């Protein structure tokens, strides 16, 4: 397979010279709709839903999970930033999970999980 | 001499040169085909196509 | 010719080249087709030839050799650049497979496949379609009939938006999925959105 | 924006070819067979033209999205959208005039 | 006179008896390959024909090559006696398993060493050969392939003539066109420089070359003395001396090389007399001998040009210039002298499949021979054996390349038996070795008076390939040399003789040909002293009934097979007949085929020879018959079983079925049809159904070629068609992992995956809709950090990253129906798959299509149409007895298009359907004098036939229409004129005037509306150009060309044109912005610069052209 002559994208295909092969090659980037519309829409829905989280919880997500500054700060790192321990934050995280999975929040976020 | 020039520019240049004393240039009207007319009056960008 | 050059204010030195440019790679893409077989435009081959000749010239100059071989390789580089800018404009065109001529750089502009004539042939547009036409005498002069299967797929953004706004869908993704599935809730909105 | 009064053409000179180009092509290698990615100073190098993936670095030092206009000192590549790869130019240096 | 035992009985309006039955309609395709391979049947056929030397194709090609030897003369090899082996697997297995129908061939190679005098001979394997099935087709990689014959100009001598514009003096130009070698042009010019153009060189005088050949000057003087211009040219040449002439020739051909007598002589011999470098096909040498009348008394063995030929050509040129009517040469008989015609079929030969395959194998064998000689010149001479010498790779490679990519190896279209039969019978005039569309002039696309009986002048493609693609006439046959022959019965002394002879173009030209329609007494005496006759070239004039020399066989001799089954073809126009013939090849096989009420006698023979109907090989008695298979007990005690393929996808999407039409305990005679394939009712072609037609405009729904159909057709499945799609996916190994098909798919609901089985494929018989998953597969993944929220959602729900992506094959857009069959090939089971693949599965989806708006219908007379509306059965006009009409056709399109034959077909169809009983108590009426005695009485729904150019005259129809039987109610609907008083379906009141009614045969074309509908709001885009694009699965955008831009500019519309070319075509960011804006409430933004202009600038700069846009100030601008 490594020993093979490549096909020049400029050879005619169909033999009528109505187009050369390089014409019929798709891209592999964000489509006009695939990512653009869904990415922007879920970003706006993020500004709507992830904003509903408490201010302290909003910062928790922004740092440990990485909304604002990225770099998901491990429980130890975010604890260093806030002074909290690795065990206490887990209970608040699970409470946030329980809060989000019920109601309009989960209804909004289902579409972006599939 | 012997170069085709549009009437407007030729007349304007002739008036400009004559007003300062330069002698007039003798020319006669001439028609030409659509192909040559298009080539004479067009952009190089449009001419290449 | 000489008067055209004199009026310019530039120099005729531009005819002799000392640095040939290269088009950006996206204009000459190397893409992996299905079956893991590589594909690439001939521009890459021509650029490879020119680069190899230039590097060999540099190596010969660095080491040093009798002027016969150096002159031969200089002729080689000149002919390679000539082939790059145009194949067949002079001499025997280069052909790797099946004695087929490599589409030179200037060939992208001239000929039937050139960019100028292709642009003169127009472009392919979105939000369009075609179908057979059947006479309908029930229509007014300012009317036409569009099959729903075509209107739905052609008005997709408008109809999906309006469907979202009527609360039939919670967001854009659900609306797109429903339009693709063509649920019965889409036809009313589609009739509403092409008034 | 879209004010183009005139469009002119001229004969490029050694200096003009270099000014358009962002980098010089030194070697003919097109792609690395094992990593399927462009080679240093080849016909596809990111150092010359641009990054293959948007907001990505060749070595990954500055792979995060929040690096705009920062050239990675480790590999000297720019961090911008992949579409720049269709815009930026290069130039070869002829050892003898042609 | 039904040749086949069990033909349906359909009386015909035949007033003449054909002395010769139609030959095997596929004989042209089969005989060529039979000659190629070489079989006893071909050998005995050739011996019967009287050929002195029966030589096959393979043996000829590899005999002319032998004996290959080295220059030193110490080595030499030969191989001959080519014989084949048995086939690998049956045709069904090869087609089902994707194999190639072939059979290996062996050649005995005798290796001889001259110095020692030793012999080493043994059989040599030479790859596989793509044998041809009985239907005259090649099964390549499981796909049916048919190679169409080609028309090329036979090698020989052509004496062209051109007239000077100024001198106004005839200029006679001669051209020799060998199969392979130099080209000679002995052309006389105003300056009188009669010269030779060898390989397009300067016009050196012919005398110089002639003396260079050793021709003494006094011989030139004596032989050419009768010529004055040539004598003066002989006196004008300056260079003299054999050595000087040879050196001049060498310099003109190869200047700057050592000029020597030996080198010049060797070059001349190599260029002209050497067989390898310069060769003339046997046909070429035969034609040259006939033209010049030299060496006619002996069989042709030497196939190379000789000095006698050149001198004879020059003599012919000078004599023709003199104006001589004929010339004679020592050893040659008197022959005429005239300019040749290129388009004549006496000069255009036909190279069938045998010729093409022979040429390809010859090329492969020569390529092999080069390497063989190179290897043998270097390898050791002691322990050399032919086995290690012969290389088989190049020959098989050439054969495969020809069968795969050659333009003369096309997919055999399989809409219906007629389409396949016509494709096998095609006569291509383009492709490799022939003319190209652009280069070829328009003078070759016209008809020639020599096409009568050889090439059908009606049938032809309507597109740009008009005149370059025809079809063999019904009776045309291909002579061994390749010239198309036609039958004729010779008249000896004014009495027609039963025995027939086949005449080619030249023989036809030199004789006199009668006309079949010319009346002849039962004793063979021409009643008319003067009979219409056809002469040399497009000349027809009355001649005494004694000078006539030859007579045709049937009036249908000049029509193809497709055109021979258009009733009342003699009444339609040529263009309309062409359109009807072409459309007869696009019919879609329905579910229940019905034989036509009115149709020529070609239906049955075309159906039988099309190969789509199984015909018993030997007479026997059927033991048990079942839908799947039938078993017949032969009279000799041996039982045979015919397996009938059912619901098998054709080559173009249609379905092929074979329903038996025999009952248990029936004795079937040999050659009787057993089951009917697609488009066949009781062993006769049936492309469509019979519909009751009323010709009238109806409220504008049938306006301008539109058609109105009764809903009875839709609800009765009259025009219901079955189509079988085909999808396939493969699991190819990747450097990153191996793809595997599994039922489990990442992140999909169970409801969607409710139809897939454990293996991961859809269960048979499960309805599949648009966008549904058809087979689930998972592809390996590398490393790609999840987006923040996507990774979070993965964490919350316990759904792991599941790196493997989804690439499951899904039903493309606009497909539906059951899943009739699934075929899976796995590398584990030792199956042949392409390199790098392990699991290949293909799923067949079958859809049943009912006629609806947009589907195309058309009769046999070239009158297309589209279903404008499908009215309820209660709205259609109905006859006086309550029989609603099934279709309405506009009357404004019949007379304008001048295809009046359709009305006559309608009248005859009504007469046949209702049945007629000609009054005979007082005696046969005058108009019925010529009607066959069996045609005076018919039963309702009878079958009638009107052979082309010989059928029911108008008087016959006028008489029949007034004698139709009454209905069961005791009333006659149609009047004598053929019109009937209809009742309106909506208003309920009778129409003021009577309307034409009758049964017309209506087909269903393959230009269905389902495939044509196309839409695209936003899909994938190209890569280099970034314009809209995408396979027809996701549909591609339309083409807004230049004329569509001038139309927009003329309107004064400027914003629409700015949009259609920038915001929805090329803008990379404008497209996304506008899609967001439409999917949002905001306005549409302003378009930017098209990428097709940025690309243009970035490319124009790369040519070292400094292109920079500037403002009024002259400042360079950034883009
Ligand atoms: Zn880096």
From Swiss-Prot, chain A:
DNA-binding stretch(es), residue numbering of this chain: 75-94
Conditions for induction: Expressed in exponential phase, peaks at 10 days and decreases after up to 50 days in culture; induced by detergent (11-fold), heat shock (23-fold, 45 degrees Celsius), low aeration (2.5-fold) and oxidative stress (2.7-fold, SigE and SigH responsive). Seen to be induced and slightly repressed by 10 mM H(2)O(2). 2- to 6-fold induced by starvation. Its basal expression is largely under control of SigE, probably via MrpAB, although other factors including SigH also play a role. Half-life of about 2 minutes.
Domain of life: Bacteria
SS bonds (residue pairs): none
Phenotypic effect of disruption: More sensitive to SDS (cell envelope stress) and hypoxic treatment in vitro. No effect in human THP-1 macrophage-like cells, intravenously inoculated BALB/c mice or aerosol-infected Hartley strain guinea pigs.
Region (Sigma-70 factor domain-4): 49-102
Its biological purpose: Sigma factors are initiation factors that promote the attachment of RNA polymerase to specific initiation sites and are then released. A non-essential principal sigma factor that responds to cell envelope stress and hypoxia. Controls a regulon of about 40 genes, with another 100 genes expression being altered during SDS stress and about 50 gene being altered during diamide (oxidative) stress.
Family: Belongs to the sigma-70 factor family.
Name used for this protein in its record: RNA polymerase sigma factor SigB
Residues of the full protein shown: 210 to 323 of 323
UniProtKB/Swiss-Prot annotation, chain B:
Family classification: Belongs to the RNA polymerase beta' chain family.
Subunit structure: The RNAP catalytic core consists of 2 alpha, 1 beta, 1 beta' and 1 omega subunit. When a sigma factor is associated with the core the holoenzyme is formed, which can initiate transcription.
Species annotation: Mycobacterium tuberculosis (strain ATCC 25618 / H37Rv)
Included stretch of the parent chain: 1177 to 1225 of 1316
Induction details: 6-fold repressed by starvation.
Name assigned to this protein: DNA-directed RNA polymerase subunit beta'
UniProt superkingdom: Bacteria
Disulfide bonds: none
Role description: DNA-dependent RNA polymerase catalyzes the transcription of DNA into RNA using the four ribonucleoside triphosphates as substrates.
Curated annotation (Swiss-Prot), chain C:
Domain of life: Bacteria
Protein name, per record: DNA-directed RNA polymerase subunit beta'
Family the entry assigns: Belongs to the RNA polymerase beta' chain family.
Its biological purpose: DNA-dependent RNA polymerase catalyzes the transcription of DNA into RNA using the four ribonucleoside triphosphates as substrates.
Induction: 6-fold repressed by starvation.
Whole sequence portion shown: 298 to 492 of 1316
Oligomer status and interactors: The RNAP catalytic core consists of 2 alpha, 1 beta, 1 beta' and 1 omega subunit. When a sigma factor is associated with the core the holoenzyme is formed, which can initiate transcription.
Swiss-Prot record, chain E:
One Pfam entry name: RNA_pol_Rpb2_2
Effect of residue 411 to V: In strain: RJ37; rifampicin-resistant
Catalytic reactions of this protein: RNA(n) + a ribonucleoside 5'-triphosphate = RNA(n+1) + diphosphate
Effect caused by changing residue 430 to P: In strain: vr12 and SP22; rifampicin-resistant
InterPro entries membership: DNA-dir_RNA_pol_bsu_ext_1_sf, DNA-dir_RNA_pol_bsu_external_1, DNA-dir_RNA_pol_su2, DNA-dir_RNAP_su2_dom, DNA-dir_RNAP_su2_hyb_sf, RNA_pol_bsu_bac, RNA_pol_bsu_CS, RNA_pol_bsu_protrusion
Protein's GO biological process: DNA-templated transcription; response to antibiotic
Effect of substituting residue 408 to P: In strain: vr2; rifampicin-resistant
Outcome recorded upon mutating residue 395 to A: In strain: vr1; rifampicin-resistant
Keyword vocabulary terms for this entry: Antibiotic resistance, DNA-directed RNA polymerase, Nucleotidyltransferase, Transcription, Transferase
Subunit structure: The RNAP catalytic core consists of 2 alpha, 1 beta, 1 beta' and 1 omega subunit. When a sigma factor is associated with the core the holoenzyme is formed, which can initiate transcription. Interacts with CarD, TRCF (Mfd) and RbpA.
Protein name (Swiss-Prot/TrEMBL): DNA-directed RNA polymerase subunit beta
């Amino acid at each position: 397979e490594h020993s093979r002559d490549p096909v020049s994208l400029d050879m005619p295909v169909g033999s009528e010279e109505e187009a050369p092969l390089g014409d019929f090659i798709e891209d592999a980037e964000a489509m006009s709709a695939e990512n653009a519309v869904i990415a922007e829409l879920l970003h706006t829905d993020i500004r709507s839903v992830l904003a509903t989280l408490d201010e302290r919880e909003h910062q928790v997500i922004r740092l440990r999970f990485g909304l604002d500054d990225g770099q998901p700060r491990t429980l130890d790192q975010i604890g260093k930033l806030f002074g909290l321990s690795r065990e206490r934050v887990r209970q608040i995280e699970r409470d946030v999970m329980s809060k989000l999975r019920h109601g309009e929040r989960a209804d909004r976020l289902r579409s972006y999980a599939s | 001499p012997g170069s085709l020039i549009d009437r407007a520019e030729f007349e304007a240049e002739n008036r400009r040169v004559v007003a300062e004393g330069g002698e007039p240039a003798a020319g006669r009207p001439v028609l030409m085909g659509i192909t040559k007319a298009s080539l004479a009056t067009d952009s190089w960008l449009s001419a290449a196509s | 010719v000489v008067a055209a050059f004199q009026q310019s204010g530039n120099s005729p030195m531009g005819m002799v080249l000392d640095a040939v440019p290269v088009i950006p790679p996206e204009l000459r893409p190397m893409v992996q087709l299905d079956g893991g077989r590589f594909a690439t435009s001939d521009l890459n081959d021509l650029y490879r030839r020119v680069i190899n000749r230039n590097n060999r010239l540099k190596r010969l100059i660095d080491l040093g050799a009798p002027e016969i071989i150096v002159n031969n390789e200089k002729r080689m580089l000149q002919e390679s650049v000539d082939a790059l800018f145009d194949n067949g404009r002079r001499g025997r065109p280069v052909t790797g497979p099946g004695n087929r001529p490599l589409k030179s750089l200037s060939d992208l502009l001239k000929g039937k496949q050139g960019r100028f004539r292709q642009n003169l042939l127009g472009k392919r547009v979105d939000y369009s379609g075609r179908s057979v036409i059947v006479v309908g005498p029930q229509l007014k002069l300012h009317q036409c009939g569009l099959p729903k299967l075509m209107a739905l797929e052609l008005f997709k953004p408008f109809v999906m938006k309006r469907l979202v706004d009527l609360n039939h869908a919670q967001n854009i993704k659900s609306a797109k999925r429903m339009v693709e599935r063509q649920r019965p809730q889409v036809w009313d909105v589609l009739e509403e959105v092409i008034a | 924006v879209n004010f183009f009064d005139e469009l002119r053409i001229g004969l490029a000179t050694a200096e003009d070819i270099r000014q358009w180009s962002y980098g010089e092509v030194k070697k003919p290698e097109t792609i690395n067979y094992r990593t399927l990615k462009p080679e240093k100073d080849g016909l596809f190098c990111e150092k010359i033209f641009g990054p293959t993936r948007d907001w990505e670095c060749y070595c990954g030092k500055y792979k995060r999205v929040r690096f705009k206009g920062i050239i990675c000192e480790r590999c000297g590549v720019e961090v911008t959208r992949a579409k720049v790869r269709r815009e930026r130019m290069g130039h070869i240096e002829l050892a003898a005039p042609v | 006179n039904n040749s086949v035992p069990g033909a349906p009985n359909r009386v015909s309006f035949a007033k003449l008896r054909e002395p010769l039955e139609v030959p095997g309609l596929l004989d042209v395709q089969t005989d060529s390959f039979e000659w190629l391979i070489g079989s006893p049947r071909w050998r005995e056929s050739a011996a019967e024909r009287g050929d002195v030397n029966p030589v096959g194709g393979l043996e000829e090609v590899l005999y002319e090559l032998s004996p290959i030897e080295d220059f030193s003369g110490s080595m030499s090899l030969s191989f001959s006696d080519p014989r084949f082996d048995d086939v690998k697997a049956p045709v069904d297995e090869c087609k089902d398993k994707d194999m190639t129908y072939a059979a290996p061939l062996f050649v005995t190679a005798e290796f001889i060493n001259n110095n020692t005098g030793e012999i080493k001979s043994q059989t040599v394997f030479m790859g596989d050969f793509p044998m041809m099935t009985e239907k005259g087709t090649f099964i390549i990689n499981g796909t049916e392939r048919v190679v169409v014959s080609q028309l090329v100009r036979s090698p020989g001598v052509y004496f062209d003539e051109t007239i000077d514009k100024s001198t106004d003096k005839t200029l006679h130009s001669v051209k020799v066109i060998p199969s392979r070698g130099a080209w000679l042009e002995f052309d006389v010019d105003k300056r009188d420089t009669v010269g030779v153009r060898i390989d397009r060189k300067r016009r050196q005088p012919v005398t110089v070359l002639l003396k260079a050949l050793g021709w003494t000057s006094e011989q030139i003087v004596e032989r050419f003395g009768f010529s004055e211009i040539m004598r003066s040219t002989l006196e004008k040449d300056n260079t003299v001396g054999t050595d000087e002439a040879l050196l001049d020739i060498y310099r003109k051909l190869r200047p700057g090389e050592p000029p020597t007598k030996e080198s010049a002589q060797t070059l001349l011999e190599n260029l002209f007399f050497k067989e390898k470098r310069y060769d003339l096909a046997r046909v070429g040498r035969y034609k040259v001998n006939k033209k010049l009348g030299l060496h006619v008394g002996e069989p042709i063995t030497s196939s190379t040009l000789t000095e006698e030929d050149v001198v004879a050509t020059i003599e012919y040129l000078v004599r023709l210039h003199e104006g001589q009517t004929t010339m004679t040469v020592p050893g040659g008989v008197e022959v005429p002298v005239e300019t040749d015609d290129i388009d004549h079929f006496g000069n255009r030969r036909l190279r069938t499949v045998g010729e093409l395959i022979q040429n390809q194998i010859r090329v492969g064998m020569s390529r092999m021979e080069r390497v063989v000689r190179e290897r043998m010149t270097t390898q050791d001479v002691e322990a050399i054996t032919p086995q290690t010498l012969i290389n088989i790779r190049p020959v098989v490679a050439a054969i495969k390349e020809f069968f795969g990519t050659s333009q003369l190896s096309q997919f055999m279209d399989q809409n219906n038996p007629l389409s396949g039969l016509t494709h096998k019978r095609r006569l291509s005039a383009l492709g490799p070795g022939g003319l190209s569309r652009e280069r070829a002039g328009l003078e070759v696309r016209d008809v020639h008076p020599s096409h009568y009986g050889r090439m059908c002048p009606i049938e032809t493609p309507e597109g740009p390939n008009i005149g370059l693609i025809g079809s063999l006439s019904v009776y045309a046959r291909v002579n061994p040399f390749g010239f198309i022959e036609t039958p004729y019965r010779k008249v000896v002394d004014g009495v027609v003789s039963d025995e027939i002879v086949y005449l080619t173009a030249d023989e036809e030209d030199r004789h006199v040909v009668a006309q079949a329609n010319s009346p002849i007494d039962a004793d063979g005496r021409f009643v008319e002293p003067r009979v219409l006759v056809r002469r040399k070239a497009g000349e027809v004039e009355y001649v005494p009934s004694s000078e006539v020399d030859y007579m045709d066989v049937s009036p249908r001799q000049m029509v193809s097979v497709a055109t021979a089954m258009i009733p009342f073809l003699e009444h339609d126009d040529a263009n309309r007949a062409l359109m009807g013939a072409n459309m007869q090849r696009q019919a879609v096989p329905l579910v229940r085929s019905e034989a036509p009420l009115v149709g020529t006698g070609m239906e049955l023979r075309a159906a039988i020879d099309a190969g789509d109907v199984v015909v018993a090989e030997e007479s026997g008695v059927i033991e048990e018959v079942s839908a799947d298979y039938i078993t017949v007990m032969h009279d000799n005690g041996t039982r045979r079983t015919y397996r009938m393929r059912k619901f098998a996808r054709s080559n173009h999407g249609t379905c092929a079925n074979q329903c038996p039409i025999v009952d248990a305990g029936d004795r079937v005679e040999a050659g009787q049809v057993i089951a009917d394939g697609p488009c066949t009712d009781d062993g006769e072609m049936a492309l469509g159904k019979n519909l009751l037609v009323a010709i009238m405009p109806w409220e504008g729904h049938n306006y301008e070629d539109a058609i109105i159909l009764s809903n009875r057709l839709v609800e009765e499945d009259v025009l219901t068609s079955i189509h079988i799609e085909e999808h396939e996916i493969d699991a190819r190994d990747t450097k990153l992992g191996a793809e595997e098909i599994t039922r489990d798919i990442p992140n999909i609901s169970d409801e969607v995956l409710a139809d897939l089985d454990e293996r991961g494929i859809v269960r048979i018989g499960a309805e599949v809709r648009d966008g549904d998953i058809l087979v689930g597969k998972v592809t390996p993944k590398g490393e790609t950090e999840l987006t923040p929220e996507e990774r979070l959602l993965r964490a919350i729900f316990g759904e792991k990253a599941r790196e493997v992506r989804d690439t499951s094959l899904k039903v493309p857009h606009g497909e539906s129906g059951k899943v009739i069959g699934i075929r899976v090939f796995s590398r584990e089971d030792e199956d042949e798959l392409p390199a790098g693949v392990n699991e290949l599965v293909r799923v067949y989806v079958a859809q049943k299509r009912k006629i609806s708006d947009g589907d195309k219908l058309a009769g046999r007379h070239g009158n297309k149409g589209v279903i404008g509306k499908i009215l309820p059965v209660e709205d259609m006009p109905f006859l006086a007895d309550g029989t609603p009409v099934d279709i309405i056709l506009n009357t404004h399109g019949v007379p304008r298009r001048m295809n009046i034959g359709q009305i006559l077909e309608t009248h005859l169809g009504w007469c046949a359907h209702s049945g007629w009983k000609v009054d005979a108590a007082k005696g046969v009426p005058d108009w019925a004098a010529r009607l066959p005695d069996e045609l005076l009485e018919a039963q309702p729904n009878a079958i009638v036939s009107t052979p082309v150019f010989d059928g029911a005259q108008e008087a016959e129809l006028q008489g029949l229409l007034s004698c139709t039987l009454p209905n069961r109610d005791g009333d006659v609907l149609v009047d004598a004129d053929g019109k009937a008083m209809l009742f309106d379906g909506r208003s309920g009141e009778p129409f003021p005037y009577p309307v034409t009614v009758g049964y017309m045969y209506i087909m269903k074309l393959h230009h269905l509306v389902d495939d044509k509908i196309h839409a695209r709001s936003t899909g994938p885009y190209s890569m280099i150009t970034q314009q809209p694009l995408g396979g027809k699965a996701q549909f591609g955008g339309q083409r807004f060309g230049e004329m569509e831009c001038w139309a927009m500019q003329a309107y004064g519309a400027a914003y629409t044109l700015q949009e259609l070319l920038t915001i929805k075509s090329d803008d990379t960011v404008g497209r996304v912005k506008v899609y967001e804006a439409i999917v949002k409430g905001e306005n549409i933004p302003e378009p930017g610069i098209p990428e097709s202009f940025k690309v243009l600038l970035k490319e124009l700069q790369s040519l070292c052209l400094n292109v920079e846009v500037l403002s009024s100030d002259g400042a360079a601008i950034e883009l």
